[PDB]
Amino acid sequence: DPGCSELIQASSRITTCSTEGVNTKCRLSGTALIRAGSVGAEACLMLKGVKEDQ
Amino acid sequence: DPGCSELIQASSRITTCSTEGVNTKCRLSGTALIRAGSVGAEACLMLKGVKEDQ
C-alpha cells in the first residue's frame, strides 16, 4: 500500500549517456550502495540523464 | 572588468537541437527573463545540448 521512503542520487563516474536519433540511451556499469527502509517502505532510486526532464 | 555574475538555466521547451554531419546544432526561439548585473557585473546565460562538452 505505501510507496517510497529513501531517495538518494546516484554517482556519475559509472553513468554515461549517448544520444542517437533524438533519443538518449544511457549506459550503467558499476557498483553502488543504497539504504534500505523499514517495513512497508521502499528503497527507491532515481537517476538523471543529460536533461532535466528525462 | 569582472566576469559573469547572474547565471540562470535555459528553458528546454523552447530550445531544439539536431545533429547534422557530426555537428549537433541547436536553435533558440523564445523569451527568457534574467536579473541584470550591477556596475561591472555581467548577465550571462547558460545553454546545454545533448552531451557534456557542448
Side-chain angles (χ1 to χ4, degrees), chain B residues 7-9 12 19 25-26 30 34 36 38 40 44 46-47 49 51:
Chain B
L7 197 275
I8 200 60
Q9 296 294 322
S12 179
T19 300
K25 64 179 73 175
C26 297
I34 195 180
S38 296
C44 299
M46 184 175 177
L47 181 63
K51 288 175 93 287

Side-chain angles (χ1 to χ4, degrees), chain A residues 16-19 21-22 24 50-53, chain B residues 10-13 17-18 48-52:
Chain A
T16 185
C17 297
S18 179
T19 300
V22 194
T24 301
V50 298
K51 290 173 94 288
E52 69 271 16
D53 56 355
Chain B
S11 178
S12 179
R13 298 294 296 163
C17 295
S18 179
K48 296 297 293 295
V50 298
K51 288 175 93 287
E52 69 272 15

Side-chain angles (χ1 to χ4, degrees), chain A residues 4-5 9 17 22 28 31-33 36-38 44-46 48-51 53:
Chain A
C4 299
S5 66
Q9 183 61 255
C17 297
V22 194
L28 292 177
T31 300
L33 193 144
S38 66
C44 295
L45 180 65
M46 69 282 198
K48 298 295 289 183
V50 298
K51 290 173 94 288
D53 56 355

Side-chain angles (χ1 to χ4, degrees), chain B residues 30-45:
Chain B
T31 62
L33 193 144
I34 195 180
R35 182 177 175 87
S38 296
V39 176
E42 295 179 354
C44 299
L45 184 63

